[model samples]
Target: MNLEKINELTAQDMAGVNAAILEQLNSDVQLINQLGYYIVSGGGKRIRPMIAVLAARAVGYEGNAHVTIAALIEFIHTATLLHDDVVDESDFGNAASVLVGDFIYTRAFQMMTSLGSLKVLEVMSEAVNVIAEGEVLQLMNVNDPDITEENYMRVIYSKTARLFEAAAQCSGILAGCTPEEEKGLQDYGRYLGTAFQLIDDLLDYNADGKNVGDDLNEGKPTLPLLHAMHHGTPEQAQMIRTAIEQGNGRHLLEPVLEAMNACGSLEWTRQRAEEEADKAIAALQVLPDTPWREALIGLAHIAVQR
Candidate 1:
């Protein structure tokens, strides 16, 4: 199963999820309605919610709770993006962004209450907190060339992987799966989430027709940059370090790109993402054979291949 197949598999569930999202996003305030609808309806793959839906099916869930949970999970994710843009001081990080982010968050909490599951509430609440902390930790590491791969991994796991982990775990909960099965699903989400983020970092440098080295411009020490720094010569390292420290522009980006290619830094990062994707596949082995399980595996492959 590829992306088309996976999307086809979850189309019905996602339609319901989208409906729930739009219904819940309703607010008396015009700005809230407008921005919330714009963000939710924007061109996202909805991969996180799809994972929730697929995990629930893999565990043989036959109810609507998973759809609700999936939408709520997306709400939390959108809220984070809004706040992250502000933290990164992007052009969209205005007062409207901050207030809308708060609105989405509170609305997500409100939706969670409708499920009446303290367990779901507990897991999602913790995920939101961890994501906030990850944001702050990344903030602290910004422009610091000394940031290790380990440091970067911690931030990614906290900020990106934790929500994926919770979403899958909650699927297991809704399906009434055993604790062992829940653990397996949780691991699947964690590894997949890590792979997803690694690919995103790789895309920052490799995406065609887009501004390459956005991370470089932001002075973010992502895995590819770290790999380049580790393998580059002293002069190359100094240049890379200075570029990061000063958040240099296209002039520095050319040399940085050259060093990354010569050192195969992007390839190294891709391999790491593949490794995580493999781990994600391995974690899903505990599930019984089903199309949903295969689709999950296919998603892992797509994460790296794309």
Candidate 2:
């Protein structure tokens, strides 16, 4: 299935998820409402929640709990973005963002409890903690050229993949999936999310977002940067190392892009992303044949297509 077809498959559930999102974002405080809506309405992919909805259906879930799971997963994501922006010093930022982030986070917990599933609570709480620690770990990694690929992968799993993992796994749990099915869904989410984040890292070197090489400018040790630094000539490596150490590396964008192309850095990183995406598709083997299963596979394809 293509994206349009997959979106059509999940439309009804996604609509419910969106409605739940808007309803939960409501607060007596006017600022909370505005900031929450602003953060969510900003054209997010909503792929995570879509996975939650599809994952439940893939396991033959027929109830409405998946909608709540989808909505809370998005809430957690939005809250993290709010906090991450403050950390990254985003355009709309400050103490207000921090407070509102906290508010939204607690609100997600409220939504989770309303489901009355301790198993989900356990999964989600652990995922949220890991995500926070991952952010802290990445903070320490900034401008540090010594960061290893393993460390970078760890950060990606915690910061990006864990929530996706939790969302899918919990959908299965709420849907009453068997242990094997839940494990399979969890693995699917992990691999797909890893692919998504890898492509995001690749995009920083060459993409339409904020600007190209934002990761270089911010001194982030993404996979593509590491690939270039490892495979480039000694002088090229040194230049990338220096660029990584320095916060403002946009001046090096030309050389970085050149080295990335010459060394096939972007190509290799994309291969890595594609590998993860393939694993995500293979992980779907435990599911019975279903349209939702095919849509999930399609999502893995789209993750690396960018």
Candidate 3:
């Protein structure tokens, strides 16, 4: 089924989630509302919240707690984006700090506070803390050409998979699933999150002049660049390392692209993503045949669509 159809099945539930978001986002500061709306309406796919709803349904949850859990997931995700844009120093130029970091952070807490479940709040708050730590770890690795694959995986897991794992765990919590099923859902989200991040790494190299390497441009040593350093020739490696050490303006990205192509780093990263996607698909073997299960499978496919 299409995503729209899935939404139809859970229409009222999603409406409540959206309403909660709108209610909690209200603030005396107008800019908070403005920036919050802008980022929320930005191009994100809302995949985490959807996973919460789908997983809850997969385990036969008939209550409304899944709606609250889904909204909480989105709030935590949004808070991260606020911190990320600031950390990345994205060149929004005239749009600098249209809303203060404190506003977004506080507003996210407002949403979390509305959900009065200590367990949900604890899991999501810890996930946010871990995500921030991962971002900081990534900052340390940036421009440092010697970063290892294991460390990179650790960063991805903390930044991406931990939140996903929390989402799945909360789904199980709301659904009252058995321990085995809970583990299954969490594993699915973990592997799916890893695969999703691998695709993101591949996209940075292959996204056709989209400035996909913005992270690299900012001197980050993502997996593809690290892998290319090991596999490419002396000149190719130097070229990439120089770009990282220096900086990637529009003109400098070409040589990095050339080195990435010559060494097949993009394809290698793509293969890794596919392998993780396979693991995600395999994790769902314990779940029963249901719409939620199908949605989980569809999520695995969606991870590699780019």
Candidate 4:
């Protein structure tokens, strides 16, 4: 479903969440404000905030704190994108017309301080640090062809799933839910994040020329490439490793695609993503059934379809 439709379904419950994002995002600095708007307005699923809002609603939260919490999550998420774009050295797929990561991250922190929620800030701050660590860790594993699945999982969990955990756990904190409910939401976020990243890995390999290289070009080790190395024949593994090490563009695309297909890397990664989606949906059983819960289910379906 479209983002507008998703927002419409959760509109009543997310009013405060929306207002808080606007308010928290306000800044006198033109560069910061411009960067903030650029990043937020950039097309994304906005999935973490959606998770926060839905988790809170499922637990019967009737306050606007969830809104502030959602904004906080978005700000932190956006800040990560800023840092990530700089590290990945991608022009952010043209998401920004100009250089803006420095200003964007600065503005994000400025907005975050307004919340006065030390706990929320702490979680977001820690998440950002972990994301950076994961990026570096993944970078180290690149082109090696010997990186283990365990290391791969650690990279994904620290870089992606941890933020999802923060989103769901913060939703529970705002909802005044019990610790058990909090744990359930946390698991849901973890599963959803894992699935989302796996699908992202697939898109990187399968997308058109303009989108080629993706993890391969960036020399980042993702599950598909790692899986191909483990399962492919020696020649297949060596060819993929050479491409990765060379950081060639579309030139290597055909061969990499062939290797991925031959080793069932695409299907393998997709199956893992689907499994995580199931886990995310199963985590919702702790809460009362409602349309909000259905939305969460729809979200899991969307993760796989991507």
Candidate 5:
């Protein structure tokens, strides 16, 4: 279940989307172009925008509008990550990053306007707004061990899944897909995004012993940590709570990993992610059987395994 096959399947359309993105990234400002090129060149998987292109084609759309739609959605997600880096703290200059961030957001809006669809504009606007709110809510949840699974789920749904939901829904809108087909596309996006984030949290715990414990070190109460907290021994729970309360708990990774292993927390998180992936695939039943729909199914499965 690798993306090589899927990438080949969507190669032509993705090329259009990628070209649009690079063209849109151009700016007279030297710093803007430099940072923009660097970020776009990095190009980490691009699952968000891929869904946009896929959904449109799956619904039988045959225009360049979906390319713009995919590019604009990618810009929206890119802008968020730029601002998010400021919030997350990195070596990049926050002021410059945020300025480029603003640039990208406006460019995305311009891209939307070029398509001349009020409905698509509305969906994209609402998604970006919801993403901002989710970012704030996520900040509040960080370093607080009291966060429940419900709140965590809500944050991921809002922050990560909302844009994905919009990507599909807007494509369906562009393709003139029926209400039921649109619903199926929307449901598939949400389910896939949720599964992706769950596996993201799992990977932060160094699933393959890669020494990645950013979530734990940052004291973020992710699903695996929550499971280990609840299911581990009483003493184990106390230690995990202390780790959460006091940030920079990377030193406790060995013990935390031990406790997580003892409680099978990673397995539990993986299983939950699998369930979401299954739901995502099942949601596609509402759409016709096509390679695009099949690639969407393949993506959900690959999401958890990663």
Candidate 6:
């Protein structure tokens, strides 16, 4: 199903999530209220929270706690985005971004504690730490062309997939699902999250009307770049290595694009994402067949297909 259809499917649940998000974002500090609402209301797919809702339904959860959990998940995610943009030196003011991020993090924790579920608290706490580690790992990997695929995957899992895993796993826990079922949902989220990140990496090279190779400009050793480096000629590899080391911009875009095309780097990365999407779908087989399960499967397909 398309995003529109998925949004429609989860509309009611997300409405509750949205209300919770807004309710939790209120603060006495005007800047906090302004920026908090700004970021929360910013146009995003809201997929993470949606996954929480969908996973809960898939596990036959009929409680309202999932809505609060979903909102909390988005709060954590938005906090990370604020911090990431500041770290990347984006237009968001450094001090403002960092402070807002701190607020969001603390707020999310408060919400977690209110849930009164030790399991949810433990899972989210671990996920937050993993995300921090992932951020540091990516920073360390910057400008280092020698980063292996294993290293990159570790960072992706730590930074991105871990949240997705926690969201699904916590939903299962809230539903009181079997350990085996929880494992299945966790795997589904991991595969889907990986695929989602891979497609994001691909968009760095394949997206339209935007600056392609932005990741290259930032010296990020994404999968496509690594694939091109592995498959390109000695000269091409050297050029890529230098660009990665120095964070070259559009100056190297043409040759890099040529090398990627020649070696099928984009296609390779896309295929990897597709494989993960397939695994995500396969992981759902353990769940009882339901519309929610089908929506989850459709979401996995959409993750790669988009």
Q: Clash number for every model?
A: 0, 0, 0, 1, 0, 0
Candidate 1: C-alpha RMSD after superposition: 1.8
Every candidate's lDDT: 0.87, 0.90, 0.76, 0.75, 0.87, 0.87
- Which model, 3 or 5, shows the larger TM-score? 5
Among residues 3 or more apart in sequence or in different chains, the pairs in candidate 5 whose N, CA or C atoms overlap within 3 Å are none
TM-score against truth, every candidate: 0.95, 0.95, 0.87, 0.86, 0.94, 0.95
Give a tens-digit lDDT track for model 5, residues 1-306.
358988888889888887888788877888667755665566578888899999998888988689889998988888998888885432376887798889989999999899888988888889889999999998898779888889999988999989888998999999989999999999998898898888888888876634577888888889899899999999999999998988799999889989999989998888999999999888889998988998888888889874
TM-score of 6: 0.95
Candidate achieving higher lDDT, 3 or 6: 6
Error of 3 at 133 (Å): 0.7
Stretch of 10 with least lDDT, candidate 5: 87-96
Question: Which one wins on lDDT?
Answer: 2
Runs with alpha carbons beyond 4 Å of true place in candidate 4:
1-5, 12-15, 87-122, 207-210
- RMSD for each of the candidates: 1.8, 1.9, 3.0, 3.6, 2.0, 1.9
Judging by lDDT, tell me the better candidate of 1 and 2: 2
Candidate 6 residue 140 Cα shift, in angstroms, is: 0.5
Clashes of 1: 0
Tens digit of per-residue lDDT, candidate 3, span 134-232? 989987886788778999999999889887888887788667798888888888888888888888877876665345657677778888887887888
lDDT: worst 10-residue window of model 4: 90-99
TM-score of 5: 0.94
